[PDB]
Design an enzyme around this catalytic site. Sequence first.
Site, short mmCIF file in Angstrom:
data_model
loop_
_atom_site.label_atom_id
_atom_site.label_comp_id
_atom_site.label_asym_id
_atom_site.label_seq_id
_atom_site.Cartn_x
_atom_site.Cartn_y
_atom_site.Cartn_z
N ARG B 37 0.86 -1.21 0.00
CA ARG B 37 0.00 0.00 0.00
C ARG B 37 0.89 1.25 0.00
O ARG B 37 2.13 1.15 0.25
CB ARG B 37 -1.04 -0.07 1.14
CG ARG B 37 -2.34 -0.84 0.78
CD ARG B 37 -3.68 -0.05 0.61
NE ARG B 37 -3.44 1.36 0.26
CZ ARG B 37 -4.08 2.45 0.73
NH1 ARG B 37 -5.09 2.43 1.61
NH2 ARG B 37 -3.68 3.59 0.30
N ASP B 70 -3.57 -1.29 9.27
CA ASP B 70 -2.81 -2.01 10.33
C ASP B 70 -1.37 -1.50 10.34
O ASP B 70 -0.55 -1.74 9.41
CB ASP B 70 -3.02 -3.52 10.28
CG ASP B 70 -2.80 -4.23 11.61
OD1 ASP B 70 -1.61 -4.39 11.94
OD2 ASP B 70 -3.82 -4.67 12.27
N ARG B 71 -1.15 -0.82 11.45
CA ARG B 71 0.15 -0.35 11.95
C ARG B 71 0.81 -1.54 12.62
O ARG B 71 0.84 -1.59 13.84
CB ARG B 71 -0.12 0.87 12.82
CG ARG B 71 -0.69 2.02 11.99
CD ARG B 71 -0.99 3.24 12.85
NE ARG B 71 -2.02 2.96 13.81
CZ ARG B 71 -3.35 3.03 13.60
NH1 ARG B 71 -3.86 3.41 12.44
NH2 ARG B 71 -4.15 2.76 14.60
N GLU B 196 -3.92 15.72 6.79
CA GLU B 196 -3.49 14.32 6.72
C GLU B 196 -2.75 14.10 5.39
O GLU B 196 -3.09 14.70 4.37
CB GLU B 196 -4.68 13.34 6.80
CG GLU B 196 -5.47 13.37 8.08
CD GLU B 196 -4.88 12.67 9.31
OE1 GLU B 196 -3.68 12.39 9.29
OE2 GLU B 196 -5.63 12.45 10.33
N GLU B 197 -1.73 13.24 5.43
CA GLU B 197 -1.11 12.63 4.24
C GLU B 197 -0.86 13.69 3.16
O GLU B 197 -1.29 13.50 2.00
CB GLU B 197 -2.07 11.57 3.72
CG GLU B 197 -2.43 10.54 4.77
CD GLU B 197 -3.41 9.51 4.28
OE1 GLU B 197 -4.23 9.89 3.43
OE2 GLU B 197 -3.31 8.28 4.69
N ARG B 212 -5.20 16.13 3.02
CA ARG B 212 -6.49 15.41 3.20
C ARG B 212 -7.10 15.89 4.52
O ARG B 212 -6.44 15.72 5.56
CB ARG B 212 -6.21 13.90 3.19
CG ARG B 212 -7.31 13.07 3.84
CD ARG B 212 -6.97 11.59 3.70
NE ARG B 212 -7.95 10.74 4.35
CZ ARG B 212 -7.90 9.40 4.34
NH1 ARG B 212 -6.92 8.76 3.71
NH2 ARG B 212 -8.82 8.70 4.98
N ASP B 213 -8.28 16.51 4.47
CA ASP B 213 -9.09 16.82 5.67
C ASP B 213 -9.97 15.60 5.97
O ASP B 213 -10.94 15.37 5.20
CB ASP B 213 -9.91 18.09 5.46
CG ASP B 213 -10.82 18.48 6.61
OD1 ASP B 213 -11.25 17.55 7.41
OD2 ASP B 213 -11.14 19.69 6.67
N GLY B 217 -14.01 18.27 5.77
CA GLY B 217 -13.78 18.99 4.51
C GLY B 217 -13.72 18.03 3.32
O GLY B 217 -12.90 17.05 3.34
N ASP B 243 -11.71 15.88 -2.71
CA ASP B 243 -11.59 14.73 -1.79
C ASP B 243 -12.53 13.61 -2.26
O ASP B 243 -13.23 13.75 -3.25
CB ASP B 243 -11.84 15.09 -0.30
CG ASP B 243 -11.17 14.19 0.75
OD1 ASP B 243 -10.41 13.26 0.38
OD2 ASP B 243 -11.34 14.48 1.95
N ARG B 287 -13.38 4.99 -4.09
CA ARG B 287 -12.05 5.20 -4.72
C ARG B 287 -12.08 4.48 -6.07
O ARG B 287 -11.41 3.45 -6.22
CB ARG B 287 -10.93 4.70 -3.82
CG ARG B 287 -10.82 5.53 -2.55
CD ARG B 287 -10.02 4.80 -1.47
NE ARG B 287 -10.06 5.63 -0.28
CZ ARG B 287 -9.35 5.40 0.81
NH1 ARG B 287 -8.62 4.32 0.89
NH2 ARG B 287 -9.36 6.27 1.81
N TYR B 321 -5.22 6.02 -3.47
CA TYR B 321 -4.36 7.16 -3.11
C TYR B 321 -3.75 7.72 -4.40
O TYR B 321 -3.63 6.94 -5.42
CB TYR B 321 -3.29 6.69 -2.14
CG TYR B 321 -3.72 6.69 -0.70
CD1 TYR B 321 -5.04 6.55 -0.33
CD2 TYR B 321 -2.75 6.70 0.29
CE1 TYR B 321 -5.41 6.56 0.99
CE2 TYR B 321 -3.09 6.70 1.63
CZ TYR B 321 -4.43 6.60 1.98
OH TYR B 321 -4.75 6.61 3.30
C1 LIG Z 1 -6.62 9.80 7.69
C2 LIG Z 1 -5.13 9.39 7.86
C3 LIG Z 1 -4.86 8.18 8.77
C4 LIG Z 1 -5.23 8.33 10.25
C5 LIG Z 1 -4.44 7.37 11.17
O1 LIG Z 1 -5.52 6.94 8.38
C6 LIG Z 1 -4.98 6.34 7.20
C7 LIG Z 1 -6.13 6.03 6.28
C8 LIG Z 1 -6.19 4.97 5.46
C9 LIG Z 1 -7.26 4.96 4.42
O2 LIG Z 1 -8.09 5.90 4.38
O3 LIG Z 1 -7.30 4.02 3.54
C10 LIG Z 1 -5.29 3.79 5.67
C11 LIG Z 1 -3.95 4.19 6.23
N1 LIG Z 1 -3.13 3.02 6.56
C12 LIG Z 1 -1.79 2.87 6.58
C13 LIG Z 1 -1.55 1.70 7.26
C14 LIG Z 1 -0.25 1.00 7.52
O4 LIG Z 1 0.68 1.47 6.55
N2 LIG Z 1 -2.73 1.12 7.56
N3 LIG Z 1 -3.68 1.96 7.19
C15 LIG Z 1 -4.15 5.09 7.50
N4 LIG Z 1 -2.87 5.46 8.07
C16 LIG Z 1 -2.40 4.97 9.24
C17 LIG Z 1 -1.13 5.55 9.78
O5 LIG Z 1 -2.99 4.10 9.85
CA LIG Z 2 -12.65 14.68 3.77
#
Ligand SMILES: CCC(CC)O[C@@H]1C=C(C(=O)O)C[C@H](n2cc(CO)nn2)[C@H]1NC(C)=O
Ligand SMILES: [Ca+2]
Lengths: 387, 387, 387, 387
Positions: B37, B70-71, B196-197, B212-213, B217, B243, B287, B321
């Site tokens: 990803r 998943d972190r 975000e991001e 990204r809001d 937003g 968005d 998406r 993305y």
């Molecule tokens: C809105 C930002 C953010 C808030 C924490 O959320 C992200 C949204 C995702 C999505 O909208 O698809 C999936 C991403 N993502 C990344 C991993 C591991 O690399 N698992 N999920 C996620 N990021 C994180 C760090 O968890």
């Molecule tokens: Ca939004």
Amino acid sequence: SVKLAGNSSLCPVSGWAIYSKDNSVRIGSKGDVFVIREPFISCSPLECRTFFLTQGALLNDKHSNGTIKDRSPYRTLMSCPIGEVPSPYNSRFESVAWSASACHDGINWLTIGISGPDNGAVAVLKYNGIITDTIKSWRNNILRTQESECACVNGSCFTVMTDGPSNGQASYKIFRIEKGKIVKSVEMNAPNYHYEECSCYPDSSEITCVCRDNWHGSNRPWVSFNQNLEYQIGYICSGIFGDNPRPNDKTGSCGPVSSNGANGVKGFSFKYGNGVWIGRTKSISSRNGFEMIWDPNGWTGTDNNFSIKQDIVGINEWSGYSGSFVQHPELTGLDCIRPCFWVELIRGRPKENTIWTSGSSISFCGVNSDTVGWSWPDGAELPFTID
Amino acid sequence: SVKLAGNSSLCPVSGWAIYSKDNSVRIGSKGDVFVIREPFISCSPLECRTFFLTQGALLNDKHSNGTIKDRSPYRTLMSCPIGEVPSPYNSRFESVAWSASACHDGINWLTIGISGPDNGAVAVLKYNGIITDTIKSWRNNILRTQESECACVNGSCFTVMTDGPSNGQASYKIFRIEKGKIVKSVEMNAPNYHYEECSCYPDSSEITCVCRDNWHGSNRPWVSFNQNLEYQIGYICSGIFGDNPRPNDKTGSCGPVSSNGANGVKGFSFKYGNGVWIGRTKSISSRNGFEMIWDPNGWTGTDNNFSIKQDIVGINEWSGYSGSFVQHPELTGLDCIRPCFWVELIRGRPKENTIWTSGSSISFCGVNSDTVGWSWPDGAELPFTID
Amino acid sequence: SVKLAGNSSLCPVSGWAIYSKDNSVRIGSKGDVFVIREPFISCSPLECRTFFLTQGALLNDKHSNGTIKDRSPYRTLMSCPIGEVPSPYNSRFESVAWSASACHDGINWLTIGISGPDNGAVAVLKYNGIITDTIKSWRNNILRTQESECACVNGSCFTVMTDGPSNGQASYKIFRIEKGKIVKSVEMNAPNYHYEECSCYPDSSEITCVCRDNWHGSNRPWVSFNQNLEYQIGYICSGIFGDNPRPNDKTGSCGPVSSNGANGVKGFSFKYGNGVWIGRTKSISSRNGFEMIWDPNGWTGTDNNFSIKQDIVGINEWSGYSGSFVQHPELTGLDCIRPCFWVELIRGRPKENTIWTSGSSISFCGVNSDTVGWSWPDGAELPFTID
Amino acid sequence: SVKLAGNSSLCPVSGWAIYSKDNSVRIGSKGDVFVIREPFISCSPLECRTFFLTQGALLNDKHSNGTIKDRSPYRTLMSCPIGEVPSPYNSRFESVAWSASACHDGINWLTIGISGPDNGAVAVLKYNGIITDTIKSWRNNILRTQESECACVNGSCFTVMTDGPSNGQASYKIFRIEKGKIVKSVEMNAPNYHYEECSCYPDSSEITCVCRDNWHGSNRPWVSFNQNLEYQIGYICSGIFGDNPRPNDKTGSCGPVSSNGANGVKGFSFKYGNGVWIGRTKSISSRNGFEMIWDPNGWTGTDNNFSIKQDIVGINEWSGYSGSFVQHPELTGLDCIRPCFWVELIRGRPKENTIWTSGSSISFCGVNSDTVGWSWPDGAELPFTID
Ligand SMILES: CCC(CC)O[C@@H]1C=C(C(=O)O)C[C@H](n2cc(CO)nn2)[C@H]1NC(C)=O
Ligand SMILES: [Ca+2]
Ligand SMILES: *[C@@H]1O[C@H](CO[C@@H]2O[C@@H](C)[C@@H](O)[C@@H](O)[C@@H]2O)[C@@H](O[C@@H]2O[C@H](CO)[C@@H](O[C@@H]3O[C@H](CO[C@H]4O[C@H](CO)[C@@H](O)[C@H](O)[C@@H]4O)[C@@H](O)[C@H](O[C@H]4O[C@H](CO)[C@@H](O)[C@H](O)[C@@H]4O)[C@@H]3O)[C@H](O)[C@H]2NC(C)=O)[C@H](O)[C@H]1NC(C)=O
Ligand SMILES: *[C@@H]1O[C@H](CO[C@@H]2O[C@@H](C)[C@@H](O)[C@@H](O)[C@@H]2O)[C@@H](O[C@@H]2O[C@H](CO)[C@@H](O)[C@H](O)[C@H]2NC(C)=O)[C@H](O)[C@H]1NC(C)=O
Ligand SMILES: *[C@@H]1O[C@H](CO[C@@H]2O[C@@H](C)[C@@H](O)[C@@H](O)[C@@H]2O)[C@@H](O[C@@H]2O[C@H](CO)[C@@H](O)[C@H](O)[C@H]2NC(C)=O)[C@H](O)[C@H]1NC(C)=O
Ligand SMILES: *[C@@H]1O[C@H](CO[C@@H]2O[C@@H](C)[C@@H](O)[C@@H](O)[C@@H]2O)[C@@H](O[C@@H]2O[C@H](CO)[C@@H](O)[C@H](O)[C@H]2NC(C)=O)[C@H](O)[C@H]1NC(C)=O
Ligand SMILES: CCC(CC)O[C@@H]1C=C(C(=O)O)C[C@H](n2cc(CO)nn2)[C@H]1NC(C)=O
Ligand SMILES: CCC(CC)O[C@@H]1C=C(C(=O)O)C[C@H](n2cc(CO)nn2)[C@H]1NC(C)=O
Ligand SMILES: CCC(CC)O[C@@H]1C=C(C(=O)O)C[C@H](n2cc(CO)nn2)[C@H]1NC(C)=O
Ligand SMILES: *[C@@H]1O[C@H](CO[C@@H]2O[C@@H](C)[C@@H](O)[C@@H](O)[C@@H]2O)[C@@H](O)[C@H](O)[C@H]1NC(C)=O
Ligand SMILES: *[C@@H]1O[C@H](CO[C@@H]2O[C@@H](C)[C@@H](O)[C@@H](O)[C@@H]2O)[C@@H](O)[C@H](O)[C@H]1NC(C)=O
Ligand SMILES: *[C@@H]1O[C@H](CO)[C@@H](O)[C@H](O)[C@H]1NC(C)=O
Ligand SMILES: *[C@@H]1O[C@H](CO)[C@@H](O)[C@H](O)[C@H]1NC(C)=O
Ligand SMILES: *[C@@H]1O[C@H](CO)[C@@H](O)[C@H](O)[C@H]1NC(C)=O
Ligand SMILES: *[C@@H]1O[C@H](CO)[C@@H](O)[C@H](O)[C@H]1NC(C)=O
Ligand SMILES: *[C@@H]1O[C@H](CO)[C@@H](O)[C@H](O)[C@H]1NC(C)=O
Ligand SMILES: *[C@@H]1O[C@H](CO)[C@@H](O)[C@H](O)[C@H]1NC(C)=O
Ligand SMILES: [Ca+2]
Ligand SMILES: [Ca+2]
Ligand SMILES: [Ca+2]
Ligand SMILES: [Ca+2]
Ligand SMILES: [Ca+2]
Ligand SMILES: [Ca+2]
Ligand SMILES: [Ca+2]
């Protein structure tokens, strides 16, 4: 780094010594090998590489399901070193492309990759992997190009593109490209001619292309031009007919031969004064076999007499596309441009009972030392597990 | 080796030429390909690379079984050459990471890898693969960053991190980094804003981030700053909402558009005075699809009128993305910074009937020559053997 | 190329930042990944590599069927880039070896591979992959060495080898090697000491090794020496016992602690004056978990008190071997020798229901910036298809 | 780059240190590994490579099915780094060949690939991968060469080819090659002698070849010559018979020993004045086991007494072809030419119940330090999945 001069003449050769074989289809039965079509070899001052179009599928996988005609958005131009199987694990990505050319000017690689819709296709030109230009379809009918190497002389590289019918008069344009930028283009005034999938080489600072007439020629059309794109046009006069399909050999013509003229195969030939080295299939009706023939008056004479035939692939074996490539003095240390050729060995659909079509390759370089005829076929046992 | 100057403006562009496509998912049906990803592209002055997160699993294996977010301790940041499938055999190890950025200053690669627990995550910075700094969570609420390239001007690299709620007011920090060492950071005064991001790019010695809001937003927030981290903030005003999810296009706002405002997708945009090039999904709810839109007053104006739309992926096809990358004059030989972008094509969960989620990618570069719209989708046939 | 000086002191560190994770066992469920044991990291002035012993077998293949402790003629020392899985497709062949060491002097790699019979084993030394010396067993009882990097100071590399019983007094020799030639060896006068699988690092032009007492020590033995192999010997005094197995923490000893002293695991520690950084398992009985502990008087003091504990692997997760590696100033640009460590995460026999044993790895570098405790375990789901 | 001088003597050696083992067949049970025969090692001033023939098939795939002799048009000469398994993903393409040699002059690789029909085969010579010459069969009876490295002195490389019967008097030619161009050849006057699969090394500006008498000799023939191809001929006189098959050791002959003389195996030996280092199978009747024997008067003396025997492969284990390779002072830094050897460990059809035949390899280098005898066999468990 120095620009290829391109100013010496083609090496005269008596025969063809085998240079590479990749066995891609045999290896791809178990290994991770791309489904490919339209390979072609091109060399820098330092190495030779195999260019090919993948559909972004591996052999013996369900995504290999597909045809000999497929202009899909999955198609990519990639390269690997000569004689290695085209794997994702050894292949350089070049461009997104369902039709392509590439050549090295002595400094960097030019790649030309055509994608998008049939009514609006765009050639993307890269120099050292950087986008340096685009050219879009001017007749909205499958903009397409060589499927073999472009040709370079003193820092300029040249190619031929077609747009329009593959079964009638179309439009044919010649391009001068410097550092991946189109610096000039001319439309060829060629009524009653048809030019597809040109094989173009440099010889004494000028370019010669031997192409495919898909409309009504069972002999091959040719165009030659200088660095300013001032051109001459004709067809190979020999009654040793170059195309597939074609009639049995007999008196030839300096214009298109209509007998068995429709359809064709990508090929090549080398001009030497009034003589010609012809590579062609051994069957008159099917992509089977391959042979080289030296016709000492075949460029400009219409008889079906020749001096040399050398067997490359046996009559009962699959062949396919063929194309020229050269080794410049900057690579070889010779005082002349060495002519070489590749042959694509097509397996699967539509002649064989598989879901897929894929090619392996063989290549040969011209020499004046002793050579031998034989058969170097693909060798794979079809069908495969996935079929 | 020289520092990238980063002092020229963005190149003006009329459309997008296709640069790369990897076919990762199609090839991972048979070959050894990472489940990935958040691909993103970033260029040194000599080559472009695809950065991506994996969880240390291959396609079509049981360890691909996953959850949408998943972190995990298994997540690593890795890189391969552009257009190549991400494989254990062609991929370079960068960092242990479940959130990441990377960018080349002209001398060496910077990589930012965040790992560790949600209540105390740590960003590990590396310069030429050597650890040069760390920064720990300051709100104890999932320290996270761009998932695309950081931006470099005259030997300094710049990124944005967020710590706090994803569904409410969070904390946003800007960082100046030299040879992998944080030399300055500022917290943004941004009440009622959500970042975000971020997709950050250099333009005339300043950085512009479009983000990204995820709170409230459906238009995109932006932050721009000089080398001293003096910053300005805003939202893209255009009625062409950026968005996903979002409403249908209508009158925009220079503040956050609350309609369908919650949740979001990583994206990008390029500012040209009052104008904007918006990259977005074609679907308002999911998406799916992708398109580039030129809105010549959309940075600062609220109407929903635009001048150009260029199809990238069709509305019925998977997208995901996206983000900016640039090509600096030190790479291209141009007199301006070339804007380019990548799209992740997400396959599997949660939209499809698989145990796994994985992306392939496409990228394009902005040019002023002819271009065309099409669809270049992922192309994989799901489900797979493992499902 | 310049010789590594080796004359600065260790960088003082407050904590451990995660540097790499390869996920080999998760990837080898489908990918072509060696069965490995005894990995270790070592760095040149330009890159870091993982060294490992294979048994000439891939994961999930019948040839992985193992004894789980076997000095076979199949075992080879190979290397790959840090954080990549060890595959036949990315791995450099080093030596034929069932016990090994390697280190880079600043000019070329030294490799040490021991093979042949238990009663007459031979260490083959290579410099730049050329054989430059051999040394044969002098007790005829499993000649064996570090299973981690040797240490280099000003053009000399140093290692420790053992020959004799693993459950009783044995013989321990130290070696000075220049350009892969043994220029000097000394036998350690060490009655009632046992030295196995030493982890050796340079510090201020002198070498310190922390080893495994497999006979009757649950604390770790140490030997330090200058360039002429004049040595001092001791055991780490801290009541924070370093070996596995071991008793619960209590009053330590500056000689071998006999309680749970038999058996052990390869390990490391870093000396800082009277203090020590101890890496060890979290379980007292089993190779499970890993932690780093800063005991500011633990080198020379016997109390069981400490200042810092940093979690690395959770107590319910498989760990295994661990060892030191350093990054010299010539690689980092720092003014001190940076301490790093690796942990082998062992999967399969004898603790799990498989036919095979194989490890993945994680590594960490010492910093003085912020860090965090967590668990980065192997993550594979056992058993595998082959089991 | 500098030409190798080739003017020093062979290094004196007391025994053999193990240099490489690739475990090809064990690894090819799961990974993508070529079916190979006729492995051989050759070194540039910078590295050592395993050259091998494949039939364009991988282990554990259906195209591995074949005969045990076969000069097919699918066979290619390829090289990988020493000790690595020969895979499509790590192997360089050299030449189309069912018989081969290669060697590095200090500037570039020479490769000799024989392909074509039995009645008119052609050797294609490449220098730096560019065709530089061909030579055609002069007896029309399977032109064939060494299947091991050619030998280089002061910018000239030397090989032997045979054309004619494998079971009676044939024709043997010596070649001098400069930059891949044959500058001289001589036909050997060798009545009642038979030369096959020569193992040729340089020694004091002269070449010595030890070969295979397939006609009527169980002792090995030899030919030595100077740069002008002025030659001497003989057989190894030692009653320690070198060929397989052979009689039990007894009084030798300086001519061919007819007892068990028909048939043979590719091998090698090293001359040291009147002495000889002999590499041979342990079995008198089959390609089983391997041992190195020093016979201090065995070049010129007929007794069956020897001074040293070193075990390499046990008598109950498969062996195969063996050959010489050397490491020149330009690679090692020594003042003498270092003698090494490789053994092929052949597995499969017809002695085992498989559809395929394939080898792995081991090599050793001569040293004067301590060595040990053992057994380093192939280790694969047949049959495989495909069988
Ligand atoms: C809105 C930002 C953010 C808030 C924490 O959320 C992200 C949204 C995702 C999505 O909208 O698809 C999936 C991403 N993502 C990344 C991993 C591991 O690399 N698992 N999920 C996620 N990021 C994180 C760090 O968890
Ligand atoms: Ca939004
Ligand atoms: C390992 O190789 C073995 C030897 O095979 C040779 O080399 C391989 C690599 C290939 O080149 C192969 O073609 C070579 O023969 C291989 O043994 C071979 O096994 C095959 C497949 O089972 C046999 O082929 C089949 O032969 C039968 C019988 O043919 C005769 O009898 C019929 C009448 O019943 C006549 O019509 C024929 O003319 C013959 O006189 C055929 O019935 C059959 O045809 C089927 O498949 C074809 C495809 O062309 C279809 O079109 C038909 O409709 C049928 O459905 C096959 O041709 C082959 O005889 C045999 N060779 C030898 C020398 O024994 C062995 O199986 C391989 N081992 C493994 C594990 O793969
Ligand atoms: C944009 O910057 C270029 C390059 O600047 C140099 O390289 C950078 C990495 C950074 O270290 C700068 O401080 C360097 O000056 C400018 O070109 C330079 O301009 C100066 C002053 O005119 C001149 O002495 C140098 O020769 C120039 N260097 C090069 C390589 O051309 C350029 O003028 C700037 N353009 C602007 C402001 O738009
Ligand atoms: C630590 O050593 C450095 C480097 O020493 C050199 O490198 C060694 C591998 C060896 O080859 C020595 O002969 C070299 O001297 C020291 O810096 C050097 O110091 C000398 C003596 O003053 C000086 O003349 C050299 O030019 C220096 N080289 C460099 C690159 O600085 C240094 O003095 C020593 N100690 C510390 C902690 O700095
Ligand atoms: C062995 O050879 C060396 C090297 O010879 C040179 O390089 C060869 C590849 C070839 O091209 C020769 O013509 C070259 O002479 C001899 O060393 C050289 O000897 C000459 C004459 O004495 C001297 O001028 C050079 O300095 C020498 N070069 C080196 C690197 O030493 C050597 O004398 C030869 N003889 C023996 C037995 O070693
Ligand atoms: C007459 C040339 C040209 C006229 C359109 O037609 C070619 C004929 C083919 C054949 O005769 O076999 C197959 C080629 N080809 C290439 C791909 C995919 O890259 N799919 N078919 C095809 N080219 C194109 C771009 O479609
Ligand atoms: C006390 C050290 C030493 C005494 C002989 O024993 C080691 C203990 C092991 C353990 O504690 O796990 C496993 C090791 N090991 C290495 C290989 C591969 O060659 N297979 N087992 C083993 N080493 C050797 C060379 O056998
Ligand atoms: C006596 C030498 C020679 C006479 C022709 O015979 C060789 C003997 C072999 C053996 O004794 O094992 C097997 C070899 N070999 C190699 C390949 C594939 O290229 N198929 N057979 C064979 N070589 C050739 C060129 O055929
Ligand atoms: C062929 O060309 C040779 C090389 O020309 C030089 O290099 C090329 C690439 C250009 O940069 C050109 O301007 C240079 O002059 C000549 O030197 C030579 O005379 C020419 N003819 C032949 C057959 O050798
Ligand atoms: C997919 O995954 C589900 C849960 O697996 C569990 O959680 C992971 C993180 C591991 O800890 C693993 O050991 C646990 O069992 C399963 O319930 C589900 O069946 C799996 N799906 C398939 C189709 O295999
Ligand atoms: C394979 O190709 C045909 C076209 O001939 C197509 O219609 C069919 O649906 C394809 N099959 C699969 C499984 O994709
Ligand atoms: C080749 O190109 C160079 C650079 O443009 C030009 O100056 C030169 O005259 C050309 N040489 C020939 C022989 O045309
Ligand atoms: C760029 O960086 C250098 C080195 O710090 C500095 O001296 C210089 O002033 C900077 N140039 C500009 C134009 O900011
Ligand atoms: C593992 O090896 C042993 C010893 O040869 C054998 O008895 C056993 O069957 C093997 N197990 C498997 C599952 O292959
Ligand atoms: C390092 O090594 C060289 C010998 O090769 C020696 O002359 C020098 O004194 C040493 N340098 C030190 C100890 O600084
Ligand atoms: C080696 O080759 C060179 C170059 O042709 C020649 O001039 C020289 O005399 C040769 N040297 C010897 C020692 O034979
Ligand atoms: Ca035609
Ligand atoms: Ca004629
Ligand atoms: Ca507008
Ligand atoms: Ca112990
Ligand atoms: Ca204490
Ligand atoms: Ca014989
Ligand atoms: Ca004797």
